[PDB]
Design a protein around this ligand. Sequence first.
Ligand SMILES: Cc1cccc(I)c1
Ligand SMILES: [Cl-]
Length: 162
Amino acid sequence: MNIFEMLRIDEGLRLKIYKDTEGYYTIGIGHLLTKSPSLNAAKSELDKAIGRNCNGVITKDEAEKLFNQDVDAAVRGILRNAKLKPVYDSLDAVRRCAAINMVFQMGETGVAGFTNSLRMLQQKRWDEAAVNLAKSRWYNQTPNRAKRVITTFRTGTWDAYK
Ligand SMILES: Cc1cccc(I)c1
Ligand SMILES: [Cl-]
């Protein structure tokens, strides 16, 4: 297991524009295109991202390329964020994958309310952090995926993905 395999499990792979769990146009391995309700707006974002006129469809290679860019962007966003970087750097590699997973799903803004969870994670109070992480819209709206991520933070193992 690694972050790519983890997120590939959580996000799936679809080569045509689809709607994510929130109803937003997405493609590939969970690549958000737009929050606009306009399919044309999503198609424009797709063409811009791939560099050709795709009319809503990409290849597996293209999906994997976008996915690598998106994982890297999540990592570099963590490293540039004064709140997230100290916690991230305190974690082991398996738990760092759980952190990337959350940033990939929700962005830096979506994790802004996790201040108390971040403190518990930095303190290595794993069961306490796991309880706190579940008290969230995130957990309630995507409970099976949140449970896997939370188990990863709780245990520092890949058990939830095996
Ligand atoms: C709980 C959490 C989420 C995103 C990033 C980090 I570091 C920690
Ligand atoms: Cl879920």
